[PDB]
Amino acid sequence: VKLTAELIEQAAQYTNAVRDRELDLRGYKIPVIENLGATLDQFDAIDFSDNEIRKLDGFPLLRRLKTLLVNNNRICRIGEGLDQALPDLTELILTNNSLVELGDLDPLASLKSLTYLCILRNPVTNKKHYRLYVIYKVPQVRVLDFQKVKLKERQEAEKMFK
Amino acid sequence: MVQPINLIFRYLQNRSRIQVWLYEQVNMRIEGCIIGFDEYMNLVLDDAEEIHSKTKSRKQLGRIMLKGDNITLLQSVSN
Amino acid sequence: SLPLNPKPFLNGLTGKPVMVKLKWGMEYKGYLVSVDGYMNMQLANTEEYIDGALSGHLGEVLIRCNNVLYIRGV
Amino acid sequence: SIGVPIKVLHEAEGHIVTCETNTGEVYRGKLIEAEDNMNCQMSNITVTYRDGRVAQLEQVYIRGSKIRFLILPDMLKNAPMLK
Amino acid sequence: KAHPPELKKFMDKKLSLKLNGGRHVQGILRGFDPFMNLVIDECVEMATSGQQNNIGMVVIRGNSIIMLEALERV
Amino acid sequence: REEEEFNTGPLSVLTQSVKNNTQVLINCRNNKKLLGRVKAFDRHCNMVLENVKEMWTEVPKSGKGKKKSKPVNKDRYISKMFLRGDSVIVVLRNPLIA
Amino acid sequence: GKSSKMLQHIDYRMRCILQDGRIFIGTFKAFDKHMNLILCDCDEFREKRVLGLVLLRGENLVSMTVEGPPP
Amino acid sequence: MKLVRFLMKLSHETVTIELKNGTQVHGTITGVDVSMNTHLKAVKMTLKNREPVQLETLSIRGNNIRYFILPDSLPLDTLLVD
Amino acid sequence: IRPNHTIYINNMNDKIKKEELKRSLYALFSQFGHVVDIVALKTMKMRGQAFVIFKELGSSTNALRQLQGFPFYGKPMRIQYAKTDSDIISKMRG
RNA sequence: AUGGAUUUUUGGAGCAGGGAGAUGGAGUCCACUCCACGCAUCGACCUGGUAUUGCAGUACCUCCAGGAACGGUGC
């Protein structure tokens, strides 16, 4: 069940609860993110929850995409050119995925508008200094794992890793 | 109830000197004695004046017909 | 005068030297040739006064009605 | 003799609506009466000016011409004007 | 059509009138016509300076009326 | 009756320009002036114009040069065009065509 | 002839441009003589704001293009 | 006489239209109606002080038009006949 | 209080602006199923609370058990099944 | 085979950003300082402290102090 143009065209399309245009791509068992061209850059949000995607990569240039819900997939790596295809990405929800090393979260530093980030229920979470590492390497984030990035944490992350 | 048109008819009869507030122009207002008027609120004013609220300066006009387009507001003055 | 209305006033002023102020502050002096029902205006030997100062000598001129602020005889 | 949007506006009488004027003041409250020409009588208003400040008014009436737009409930979206 | 504005409810009440040009006046509604031209009695100009000056009974052309607000309960 | 008002009224300026194929300058709301011949006109002063010289004035239109604060005149030729009449301020007939 | 030019785009998502220069994007559900428009699930851009069900007066409308297909 | 009628005949022509707000529109007319509401296809539209955007379709409220620039080829004398 | 499509949350940090609260709520709760809508007001009465509505009932029950006492913006949230059925649910059902 | 005179389609729009300094850089533009932080008001928002534990379908939402980025209106 390839993510195909035909698949996207019959997919529930609606205005979500936070007033954004969202496309519903839940529970299709998609393994690879591809063929997004067919959405025609018409969505503010794309819901990819409960699928089998391994890597957050493969996006076309999508100027209107601001929210990506990627819950319960198998994300173990993040693509390197994400800001070049998603310039205004502001919210990224990665709860319950497979990111294991702090260094695998490095590609998120290039998403200049990224403000809401959630990486809960990922092995990487239990790594020593996981929170400070994210704060220093992705300073554009204001809310991390539903907790406010505070000044004291920023300073503390400036010492360690300076 | 007083109808607005009638108020004017009263101004006309009275020969009260009238001061007009113009549309989207605050720095200048117009003055004169209504001699007659029409269905479009176009006014014929006698011994009329441009009044510069900023410069405190008056420009003398004589016989004026002001299009109603400009009318914001109509008031009477004792002078 | 006993009621002198817009329409007759203007008609009396046809054949006469007038000046028209426009909403935009331009002024046009000339002989009023004619006016119509919508109060569009036709001047001859028109002159233009902008900032109250002679700018341009223009000749025969149509002024669209919606532009007119007021008309004065002189 | 009347426009489809106008019928939908009259349908919002008695509901809480938001109105922006031609000058960008934003008036939220109960729509009492809506005329054919979009003249709007409202009550218990919250007004939000262009500077951001708020105020409270009991009773207002805004001329239809000087309205830029209105926001109506979503309660209306369902029926009957789906055609 | 040629409808009246529904303003009988506001008759002989004190009102606050927002006009174009950022102009504001206050007075008692004495009457109106289908164009929403108003008669306002005991009218007061609320100058942008904060100062208020009494202008008496006046005509406001409906054209330039942005908004009105009752200072009474209807 | 209506033809009479076009014929003798202020719009006779347009009526005369179409008949004689003469030039007229149109002062225009856009702060531009359109100089040409009247192929057609109507009540609203919509017009179909030929051999139009549009003239206007500008500052410097910074794009890839300098500043040089000094007003600039501009013009451009337009053979065939339709003008919506609301934009009309003034319409001028003259010894222009001559 | 056909009158369809508006009726064609009905039910579609539409990008509407206002006279002040705002962008209203919503589902085009109804219009009229004056081009007063009914826009479902409507957002405003210049910054994005969720508005919801919007009636826009035609006086202040400039233009419209097709933004996306009907939901 | 009623010059909108003339414009209504220009379906399938390509034109440039200048708007009251300064915007410039180049596209192919699909329809002009009685209110001069104009509909186009294959449209390159340049708002004042932007680079152009291309739209497959655009619909203009008639009043917002300043003027149409017509094809040089256009046979006006034909079109002015009723 | 029987299982319900809508969950009632209280004990929420009321300093978060309303639109941010609703967007984080949506994000957090999307992991269990599609959230149809969220009702949250800042009135004195309703501040620190929210109603989260899900399309599926199983999603509401899972959310309730798994996020009971989850630290959200600093405080442990308290979740419960709502007393009544949500207007949106009633309209979607009949 | 169709409508330019107050709420819709023949438009009331157009146009300019205070003054100075042996200021700095590329008559014009940008940054900094001083006189007149251009002034006042409202909203959202940024720091702390502090109040509220409440079952809802919403202009906006505790209060106190400080900080002012943005938007609107008036002079």
Tab-separated table of N, CA, C and O in Angstrom, chain H residues 10-77:
chain	number	residue	atom	x	y	z
H	10	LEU	N	-15.297	39.184	-26.754
H	10	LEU	CA	-13.842	38.932	-26.797
H	10	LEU	C	-13.382	37.621	-26.128
H	10	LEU	O	-12.202	37.448	-25.845
H	11	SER	N	-14.302	36.672	-25.947
H	11	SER	CA	-13.921	35.328	-25.527
H	11	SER	C	-12.849	34.762	-26.448
H	11	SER	O	-12.867	34.970	-27.675
H	12	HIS	N	-11.876	34.114	-25.830
H	12	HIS	CA	-10.775	33.435	-26.539
H	12	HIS	C	-9.699	34.382	-27.079
H	12	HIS	O	-8.775	33.974	-27.791
H	13	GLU	N	-9.812	35.646	-26.727
H	13	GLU	CA	-8.762	36.568	-27.023
H	13	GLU	C	-7.830	36.566	-25.858
H	13	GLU	O	-8.255	36.402	-24.709
H	14	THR	N	-6.568	36.879	-26.134
H	14	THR	CA	-5.644	37.230	-25.049
H	14	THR	C	-5.429	38.745	-24.941
H	14	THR	O	-5.211	39.445	-25.938
H	15	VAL	N	-5.504	39.215	-23.690
H	15	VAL	CA	-5.431	40.635	-23.356
H	15	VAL	C	-4.545	40.878	-22.136
H	15	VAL	O	-4.252	39.950	-21.366
H	16	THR	N	-4.149	42.139	-21.984
H	16	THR	CA	-3.592	42.639	-20.753
H	16	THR	C	-4.596	43.613	-20.142
H	16	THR	O	-5.105	44.508	-20.817
H	17	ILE	N	-4.893	43.429	-18.861
H	17	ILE	CA	-5.791	44.321	-18.149
H	17	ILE	C	-5.038	44.991	-17.013
H	17	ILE	O	-4.309	44.327	-16.253
H	18	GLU	N	-5.210	46.305	-16.900
H	18	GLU	CA	-4.681	47.027	-15.771
H	18	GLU	C	-5.815	47.307	-14.808
H	18	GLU	O	-6.863	47.840	-15.197
H	19	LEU	N	-5.574	46.962	-13.543
H	19	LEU	CA	-6.548	47.154	-12.473
H	19	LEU	C	-6.440	48.508	-11.776
H	19	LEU	O	-5.398	49.185	-11.821
H	20	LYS	N	-7.527	48.875	-11.103
H	20	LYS	CA	-7.570	50.089	-10.292
H	20	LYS	C	-6.502	50.081	-9.199
H	20	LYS	O	-5.866	51.100	-8.924
H	21	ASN	N	-6.282	48.923	-8.593
H	21	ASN	CA	-5.218	48.801	-7.604
H	21	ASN	C	-3.809	48.595	-8.206
H	21	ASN	O	-2.901	48.134	-7.504
H	22	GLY	N	-3.640	48.889	-9.496
H	22	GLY	CA	-2.338	48.848	-10.143
H	22	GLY	C	-1.909	47.498	-10.668
H	22	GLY	O	-1.003	47.422	-11.514
H	23	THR	N	-2.566	46.434	-10.207
H	23	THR	CA	-2.267	45.062	-10.642
H	23	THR	C	-2.422	44.902	-12.170
H	23	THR	O	-3.313	45.502	-12.793
H	24	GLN	N	-1.521	44.107	-12.754
H	24	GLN	CA	-1.546	43.815	-14.187
H	24	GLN	C	-1.837	42.346	-14.461
H	24	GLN	O	-1.198	41.445	-13.897
H	25	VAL	N	-2.789	42.121	-15.355
H	25	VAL	CA	-3.285	40.790	-15.629
H	25	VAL	C	-3.149	40.507	-17.114
H	25	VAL	O	-3.722	41.222	-17.922
H	26	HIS	N	-2.461	39.421	-17.455
H	26	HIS	CA	-2.397	38.931	-18.831
H	26	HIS	C	-2.930	37.489	-18.916
H	26	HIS	O	-2.392	36.583	-18.277
H	27	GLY	N	-3.989	37.292	-19.697
H	27	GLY	CA	-4.607	35.988	-19.834
H	27	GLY	C	-5.615	35.955	-20.966
H	27	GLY	O	-5.794	36.932	-21.699
H	28	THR	N	-6.229	34.787	-21.146
H	28	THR	CA	-7.197	34.550	-22.226
H	28	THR	C	-8.625	34.580	-21.726
H	28	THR	O	-8.985	33.831	-20.815
H	29	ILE	N	-9.438	35.420	-22.353
H	29	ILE	CA	-10.781	35.661	-21.857
H	29	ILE	C	-11.643	34.457	-22.110
H	29	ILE	O	-11.760	33.983	-23.235
H	30	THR	N	-12.231	33.963	-21.035
H	30	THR	CA	-13.230	32.902	-21.119
H	30	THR	C	-14.646	33.501	-21.114
H	30	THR	O	-15.573	32.923	-21.691
H	31	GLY	N	-14.807	34.667	-20.480
H	31	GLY	CA	-16.107	35.315	-20.416
H	31	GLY	C	-16.110	36.695	-19.782
H	31	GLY	O	-15.523	36.920	-18.724
H	32	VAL	N	-16.804	37.627	-20.428
H	32	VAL	CA	-17.167	38.892	-19.798
H	32	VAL	C	-18.693	38.880	-19.686
H	32	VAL	O	-19.400	38.505	-20.642
H	33	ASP	N	-19.184	39.268	-18.516
H	33	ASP	CA	-20.618	39.418	-18.321
H	33	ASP	C	-21.065	40.896	-18.326
H	33	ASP	O	-20.249	41.814	-18.558
H	34	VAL	N	-22.358	41.104	-18.089
H	34	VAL	CA	-22.970	42.428	-18.158
H	34	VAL	C	-22.366	43.412	-17.140
H	34	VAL	O	-22.319	44.626	-17.416
H	35	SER	N	-21.910	42.919	-15.984
H	35	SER	CA	-21.254	43.791	-15.001
H	35	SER	C	-19.771	44.017	-15.282
H	35	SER	O	-19.028	44.513	-14.399
H	36	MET	N	-19.331	43.631	-16.484
H	36	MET	CA	-17.929	43.633	-16.850
H	36	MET	C	-17.105	42.676	-15.955
H	36	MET	O	-15.880	42.764	-15.927
H	37	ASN	N	-17.764	41.769	-15.217
H	37	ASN	CA	-17.028	40.755	-14.491
H	37	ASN	C	-16.354	39.927	-15.599
H	37	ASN	O	-17.011	39.502	-16.546
H	38	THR	N	-15.030	39.769	-15.483
H	38	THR	CA	-14.209	39.156	-16.527
H	38	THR	C	-13.538	37.889	-15.973
H	38	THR	O	-13.048	37.859	-14.838
H	39	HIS	N	-13.589	36.833	-16.777
H	39	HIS	CA	-13.057	35.533	-16.409
H	39	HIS	C	-12.017	35.145	-17.434
H	39	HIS	O	-12.203	35.362	-18.653
H	40	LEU	N	-10.904	34.597	-16.955
H	40	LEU	CA	-9.794	34.266	-17.836
H	40	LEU	C	-9.200	32.905	-17.537
H	40	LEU	O	-9.441	32.312	-16.472
H	41	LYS	N	-8.387	32.446	-18.482
H	41	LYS	CA	-7.545	31.259	-18.320
H	41	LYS	C	-6.101	31.540	-18.748
H	41	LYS	O	-5.824	32.490	-19.494
H	42	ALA	N	-5.191	30.694	-18.274
H	42	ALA	CA	-3.758	30.778	-18.605
H	42	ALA	C	-3.287	32.167	-18.298
H	42	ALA	O	-2.885	32.928	-19.187
H	43	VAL	N	-3.401	32.499	-17.019
H	43	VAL	CA	-3.218	33.862	-16.565
H	43	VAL	C	-1.894	34.085	-15.847
H	43	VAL	O	-1.589	33.380	-14.873
H	44	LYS	N	-1.145	35.083	-16.323
H	44	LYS	CA	0.042	35.588	-15.650
H	44	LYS	C	-0.332	36.942	-15.061
H	44	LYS	O	-0.479	37.937	-15.796
H	45	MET	N	-0.447	36.976	-13.730
H	45	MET	CA	-0.898	38.153	-12.987
H	45	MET	C	0.207	38.720	-12.090
H	45	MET	O	0.845	38.001	-11.309
H	46	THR	N	0.456	40.010	-12.255
H	46	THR	CA	1.547	40.670	-11.575
H	46	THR	C	0.957	41.778	-10.747
H	46	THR	O	0.581	42.847	-11.262
H	47	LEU	N	0.843	41.514	-9.451
H	47	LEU	CA	0.412	42.559	-8.534
H	47	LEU	C	1.538	43.566	-8.525
H	47	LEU	O	2.697	43.191	-8.700
H	48	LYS	N	1.190	44.839	-8.362
H	48	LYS	CA	2.195	45.887	-8.332
H	48	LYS	C	3.260	45.533	-7.286
H	48	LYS	O	2.936	45.174	-6.154
H	49	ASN	N	4.524	45.578	-7.703
H	49	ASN	CA	5.667	45.212	-6.855
H	49	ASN	C	5.677	43.753	-6.395
H	49	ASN	O	5.912	43.447	-5.219
H	50	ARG	N	5.405	42.861	-7.339
H	50	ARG	CA	5.749	41.450	-7.196
H	50	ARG	C	6.258	40.893	-8.502
H	50	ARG	O	6.082	41.507	-9.542
H	51	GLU	N	6.879	39.719	-8.439
H	51	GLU	CA	7.088	38.945	-9.640
H	51	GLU	C	5.773	38.205	-9.935
H	51	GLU	O	4.987	37.898	-9.009
H	52	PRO	N	5.520	37.920	-11.225
H	52	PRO	CA	4.245	37.350	-11.687
H	52	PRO	C	3.880	36.050	-10.983
H	52	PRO	O	4.762	35.328	-10.530
H	53	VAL	N	2.584	35.773	-10.867
H	53	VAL	CA	2.131	34.427	-10.509
H	53	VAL	C	1.263	33.903	-11.652
H	53	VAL	O	0.557	34.679	-12.293
H	54	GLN	N	1.346	32.599	-11.913
H	54	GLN	CA	0.537	31.997	-12.958
H	54	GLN	C	-0.580	31.194	-12.401
H	54	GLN	O	-0.413	30.360	-11.490
H	55	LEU	N	-1.727	31.451	-12.984
H	55	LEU	CA	-2.938	30.855	-12.544
H	55	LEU	C	-3.580	30.272	-13.759
H	55	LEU	O	-3.595	30.857	-14.826
H	56	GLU	N	-4.167	29.110	-13.562
H	56	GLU	CA	-4.908	28.476	-14.614
H	56	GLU	C	-6.217	29.232	-14.873
H	56	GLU	O	-6.691	29.261	-16.003
H	57	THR	N	-6.800	29.806	-13.824
H	57	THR	CA	-8.039	30.559	-13.954
H	57	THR	C	-8.069	31.743	-13.004
H	57	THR	O	-7.579	31.651	-11.877
H	58	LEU	N	-8.644	32.847	-13.481
H	58	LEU	CA	-8.863	34.047	-12.660
H	58	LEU	C	-10.164	34.792	-13.023
H	58	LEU	O	-10.481	34.951	-14.221
H	59	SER	N	-10.888	35.232	-11.978
H	59	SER	CA	-12.166	35.918	-12.121
H	59	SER	C	-12.148	37.269	-11.458
H	59	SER	O	-11.956	37.393	-10.241
H	60	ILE	N	-12.388	38.299	-12.267
H	60	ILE	CA	-12.272	39.694	-11.829
H	60	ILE	C	-13.654	40.350	-11.718
H	60	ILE	O	-14.455	40.293	-12.633
H	61	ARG	N	-13.903	40.973	-10.575
H	61	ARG	CA	-15.047	41.843	-10.443
H	61	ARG	C	-14.862	43.074	-11.343
H	61	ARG	O	-13.828	43.760	-11.301
H	62	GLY	N	-15.885	43.337	-12.151
H	62	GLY	CA	-15.806	44.287	-13.254
H	62	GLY	C	-15.363	45.660	-12.859
H	62	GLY	O	-14.521	46.270	-13.528
H	63	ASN	N	-15.885	46.134	-11.732
H	63	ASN	CA	-15.562	47.491	-11.258
H	63	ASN	C	-14.058	47.750	-11.020
H	63	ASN	O	-13.599	48.884	-11.117
H	64	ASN	N	-13.306	46.678	-10.737
H	64	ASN	CA	-11.882	46.773	-10.367
H	64	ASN	C	-10.947	46.928	-11.551
H	64	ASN	O	-9.731	47.082	-11.389
H	65	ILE	N	-11.534	46.911	-12.738
H	65	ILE	CA	-10.816	47.133	-13.958
H	65	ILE	C	-10.588	48.616	-14.210
H	65	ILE	O	-11.519	49.441	-14.102
H	66	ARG	N	-9.345	48.963	-14.533
H	66	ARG	CA	-9.054	50.291	-15.060
H	66	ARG	C	-9.266	50.260	-16.587
H	66	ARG	O	-10.124	50.986	-17.128
H	67	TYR	N	-8.476	49.422	-17.257
H	67	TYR	CA	-8.560	49.290	-18.701
H	67	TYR	C	-7.998	47.985	-19.293
H	67	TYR	O	-7.122	47.312	-18.695
H	68	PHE	N	-8.512	47.645	-20.478
H	68	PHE	CA	-8.047	46.507	-21.223
H	68	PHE	C	-7.104	46.994	-22.308
H	68	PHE	O	-7.466	47.905	-23.048
H	69	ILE	N	-5.949	46.333	-22.448
H	69	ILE	CA	-5.129	46.477	-23.642
H	69	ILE	C	-5.433	45.303	-24.589
H	69	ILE	O	-5.200	44.135	-24.271
H	70	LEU	N	-5.953	45.648	-25.764
H	70	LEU	CA	-6.446	44.672	-26.735
H	70	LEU	C	-5.367	44.245	-27.729
H	70	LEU	O	-4.409	44.989	-27.932
H	71	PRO	N	-5.520	43.047	-28.364
H	71	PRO	CA	-4.629	42.606	-29.454
H	71	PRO	C	-4.535	43.645	-30.552
H	71	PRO	O	-5.553	44.260	-30.900
H	72	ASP	N	-3.333	43.873	-31.076
H	72	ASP	CA	-3.199	44.892	-32.121
H	72	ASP	C	-4.050	44.520	-33.323
H	72	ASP	O	-4.598	45.385	-34.015
H	73	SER	N	-4.128	43.209	-33.548
H	73	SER	CA	-4.857	42.629	-34.662
H	73	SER	C	-6.368	42.893	-34.582
H	73	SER	O	-7.071	42.802	-35.606
H	74	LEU	N	-6.878	43.196	-33.396
H	74	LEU	CA	-8.302	43.182	-33.215
H	74	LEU	C	-9.027	44.085	-34.263
H	74	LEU	O	-8.626	45.226	-34.465
H	75	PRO	N	-10.074	43.537	-34.962
H	75	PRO	CA	-10.835	44.239	-36.007
H	75	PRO	C	-12.006	44.962	-35.391
H	75	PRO	O	-13.129	44.493	-35.417
H	76	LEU	N	-11.719	46.122	-34.837
H	76	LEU	CA	-12.698	46.854	-34.059
H	76	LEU	C	-13.959	47.164	-34.837
H	76	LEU	O	-15.059	47.071	-34.313
H	77	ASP	N	-13.799	47.551	-36.100
H	77	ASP	CA	-14.951	47.984	-36.890
H	77	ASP	C	-15.975	46.870	-37.021
H	77	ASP	O	-17.174	47.145	-36.917
